[PDB]
Design a protein around this ligand. Structure first.
Ligand SMILES: [Zn+2]
Ligand SMILES: [Zn+2]
Ligand SMILES: [Zn+2]
Lengths: 173, 173, 173
């Protein structure tokens, strides 16, 4: 596997976590219960700590990094889509980060936000809870409905389930 | 290698296929004759089936996935560029998907289309044959010329050839 | 590791280089002193040669490729950010390529340029030294200040240092 200890800092991974063999986890990284990191994703905890909250998933090729003074915190029940890039930011509980979305240092995404695929959130930007954030540079286009939020959570919960399926039914050929 | 069987579903790969050691193939995936999947690419067939048509290539870091009710079908002679992301869509024969392009569920790209680098095709969008599709959200900017189409195909055919070269002349150091 | 010889062409890597185990280096590739290639990055030297200048870094998931007649040359002291894609272009000394930025064939980036995250530089575009290049298609928005340039270099130099730390303190778990 690609789980690495850097210096004296070794990842803290809950047993229930699914970490794909090609998912790189380095240094100061905390992966909470029911979280999952997929193929090709990389979580490099060499500067500030990086936390992936319980029930949260980090999909294929997503890259999580930080810079000094910019810890990366992903709250519980969050989906980080394929190829996304989170850099030293804060993601609120229940949010969904779209495919290839880019979020830079100091950015703060509130609870239940949906960041659109291909969006780019610049450094220091803050967004209120339940916001649909689209564009590059991204901005709040409107508030999400109960349905939007419920579908986002359904996807995230589905991944928390898929996690167990991959842990017990995935066999190399 | 990173070829995985998920549950009872194992990938169907034609012997002529080139699958890079770091290319992840999981579950319900069909890779037809002369297709090729490069380093870091991931094809996750855990929901709907994913088919890569004969003579088609999936370049470095591209990620192919689907959601229930949204199978991913890549027709023959198609090029999927580096870092692209295809999610539950349909790609017509002879097309070219640009670098980092993103195509979401239910999108349908006709035959001989060229999707520009960095474009974003939203869910459900459909585009006619021979279209040059650019933007995010992407749209048809104009019809491609015989030359445009011929150059696209030349690239794809070149990859079908490069496939054999890598299968027999690539040696780990 | 993922260092590959293609045909008769084998990578030329300076001993001081840090090459992550999952970093793919193939064929005609030259990695100069103090350069570093991170997890999931791929440098495919199967067409034209690809050179990574001394003290330059190629971050997670970045993909470097070329096409015939389009060599890829990355000058010394350059930072290529996470998930960037450089295709047959020329990057001037002291520059910084932002996260997920895409630069296509024949593009020329002068010395000390900063390409913004998510930008897309089309084929053949040329940009003068000390330019802040943003957008897709990207363009020069303004000249960088001494500070901007100095901070860019600080990041790149920091990576040249981090390189040694990973070479001696990174241990698989
Ligand atoms: Zn970083
Ligand atoms: Zn998906
Ligand atoms: Zn290429």
């Amino acid at each position: 596997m690609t789980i690495y200890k850097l210096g004296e800092n070794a990842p803290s991974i809950h047993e229930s976590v699914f970490v794909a063999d090609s998912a790189t986890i380095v240094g100061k990284v905390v992966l909470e219960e029911n979280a999952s990191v997929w193929f090709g994703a990389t979580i490099r905890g060499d500067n500030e700590p990086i936390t992936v909250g319980a029930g949260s998933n980090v999909q294929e090729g997503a890259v999580l990094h930080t810079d000094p003074g910019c810890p990366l915190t992903i709250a519980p029940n969050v989906t980080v889509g394929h190829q996304a890039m989170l850099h030293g930011c804060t993601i609120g509980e229940g949010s969904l980060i779209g495919i290839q979305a880019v979020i830079l240092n100091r950015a703060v995404i509130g609870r239940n936000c949906l960041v659109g695929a291909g969006a780019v959130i610049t450094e220091g930007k803050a967004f209120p809870d339940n916001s649909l954030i689209l564009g590059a540079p991204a901005k709040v286009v409107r508030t999400l409905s109960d349905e939007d939020i419920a579908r986002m959570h359904m996807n995230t919960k589905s991944y928390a389930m898929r996690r167990a399926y991959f842990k017990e039914q995935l066999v190399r050929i």
